[PDB]
Amino acid sequence: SLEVKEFALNLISQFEPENQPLGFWIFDTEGVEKAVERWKKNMPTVRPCFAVKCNPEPHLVKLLGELGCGFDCASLNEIKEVLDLGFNPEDITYSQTFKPYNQLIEASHLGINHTIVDSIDEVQKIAKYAPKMGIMIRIMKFGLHDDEVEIVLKEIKDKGLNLDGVHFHVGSDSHNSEVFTKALTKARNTVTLAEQFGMKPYLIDIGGGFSQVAPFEEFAATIEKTIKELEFPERTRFIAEPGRYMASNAFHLVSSLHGKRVRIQNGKKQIEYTSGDGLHKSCECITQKVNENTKMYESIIYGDKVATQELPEMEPGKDWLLFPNMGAYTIHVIYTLPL
Amino acid sequence: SLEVKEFALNLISQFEPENQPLGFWIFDTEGVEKAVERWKKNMPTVRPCFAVKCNPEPHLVKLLGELGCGFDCASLNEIKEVLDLGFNPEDITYSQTFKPYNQLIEASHLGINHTIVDSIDEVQKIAKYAPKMGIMIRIMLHDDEVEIVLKEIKDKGLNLDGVHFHVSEVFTKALTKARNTVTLAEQFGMKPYLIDIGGGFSAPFEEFAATIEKTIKELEFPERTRFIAEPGRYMASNAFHLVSSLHGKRVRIQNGKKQIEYTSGKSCECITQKVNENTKMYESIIYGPSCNDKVATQELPEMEPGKDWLLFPNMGAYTIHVIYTLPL
């Protein structure tokens, strides 16, 4: 965007080579809002619960919650961060398959009422320390196998515990849409099975792994259509755990250069750069505008190796790099974008 | 490690599931001293400089500096930490190929007199902001380029400290490749006195240190030449021991025989219970943090979370939250 480029340049001008930091973040408030209203439009029946683990930055977590998003917390620290921002503990879901005893007890005292289980031991762990917490069964390491579902449901019933419903999380190898279709059908069967156990499961957590099925508008339409076709009980509500989807367009990294090496190899020179970070995606050189024939060279950018991209020859201390749409798991001053 | 086992089992018996921590560290002071004296006994002509980047934990960094070790710092934070512990800036070497301008200017004021280079640009940077700082050339295209950099060092009027490289017979080639560079630089009108062989140590060690010490003599470096190294994993490994607690268990029958998964806070031991020969063993998988991560797939007996713990021997190598100093 042009507004992001101009705001970055206005901030870069405040620095000389001697005083320039490793980099700075740009908080795209409109980028967060556009992602939320896009979700609410395409998936009306599924309320998004942001995975705080993806990006626990106070401003983003605050903004998302104010926009009506729920909260997906993996640890007690993530639980406490949400509660400190003034959000109600009912909107929080303690999504941790194996919880530390001290944290599980503290969560109960803090007012947390929703958690996830994928083992017979965790059912007993909850029954012993916080037996009032609602339990969600995780289906498909990480998850519960087909035959084990009955053994766990029996244990939840035998311990007299509350079942909120079913949960599933797909891997990083999402891409194929039909895995969500199968997992929802598998979840629908788990509901009717649990209903026979005398339980009333009202919550289906479809998990995360979004923005990995590209035509989102269409991918959201398929989930929405499948939800209707499976005919879930009238009382059932649907939540998701989108992390990468919400956090991506939230932040923009603007890094500085503090190293250069020109190396002619196999006939043509490649230029190595060292960007503001320790040596251990797509970016552009914002400081100089490309005049078409600006002599583009294959550039290797180091943190170990953050980007291999076609870039014009840059001068360390003068030239800067903008990495568009970061914050997604990538988590040093943060400047809010003007709007 | 009978003494370490008893010190842990004592601290374990103090916790119940309700208040058990994720894990605690045991700082083996004796383990550091034995590793340091092993270096000096087997490699006397090479002075060890600890890579603070490997483990910047104050207890390790302070003890090593008292034992005679130098300091290898990759950033200004590592430089300042060493100086805050009360160490002479001469013992510190700013080992960073590409330094930020602000950090380099500050390092010059802090008293840092030694740094490394591998590119022609970094030479001009040091000449522009910290010209008094001594320079080391990096070796192993980066071979014919050595002549290009040395010319830039000379033309800017900078002090050449010597040659530095980072990787059994690979060291023999690298030390010889360094010796040929020294004579090359001497013909330019420069006097390289420092040779940094790098790290990656711990290999039989005793035999490895013998080949290095022998190769040093055969190459016949000038009388003034001093030898230094950057061992990280070597010094840090035996310094700390991790004692994890268990807060997750899952039983799963696999094709006939059961495998049990565990979630805790390489080699590990169930110190909470004694394993008398046959006490029933199971293919156990131990996990850590991150909910989508895998530390061990080891042969272990059945364990109960909250009751049973884990001891990971020699874990101080690259980790960096509670430290218990091992007696005595």
Author numbering:
A (entry chain A): 5 to 144, 157 to 296, 309 to 331, 338 to 365, 379 to 386
B (entry chain B): 5 to 144, 160 to 186, 193 to 227, 230 to 292, 309 to 335, 338 to 365, 379 to 386
Give the authors' words:
Ornithine decarboxylase catalyzes the first and rate-limiting step of polyamine biosynthetic pathway. The ODC enzyme is an obligate homodimer with two symmetry-related active sites located at the dimer interface. The ODC enzyme from E. histolytica belongs to fold type III group IV decarboxylase of a B6-dependent family, having eukaryotic ornithine decarboxylase characteristics.
Here, we report cloning, purification and crystal structure determination of C-terminal truncated Entamoeba histolytica ornithine decarboxylase (EhODCΔ15). The four monomers in the asymmetric unit of crystal are arranged as two separate dimers (subunits A, B and subunits C, D) facing each other at the convex surfaces. Each monomer consists of β/α barrel and β-sheet domain which are arranged identical to previously known ODC structures. As expected, the crystal structure of EhODC contains two equivalent active site pockets at the dimer interface formed by residues that are contributed from both the subunits. In contrast, Cys'334 the conserved residue of EhODC that is expected to form a covalent bond with DFMO is slightly displaced from its position and has distinct orientation that is structurally unfavourable for covalent linkage with DFMO. In contrast, the cofactor PLP and substrate L-ornithine are accommodated in EhODC active site with polar interactions to facilitate the catalysis. These structural details indicate that amino acid substitutions in the active site of EhODC create a novel architecture which not only makes it resistant to DFMO but also lowers its catalytic efficiency by weakening substrate binding, as the reported Km values for L-ornithine for active but DFMO sensitive T. brucei and mouse ODC enzymes are 0.24 mM and 0.09 mM respectively, whereas for DFMO resistant EhODC it is 1.5 mM.
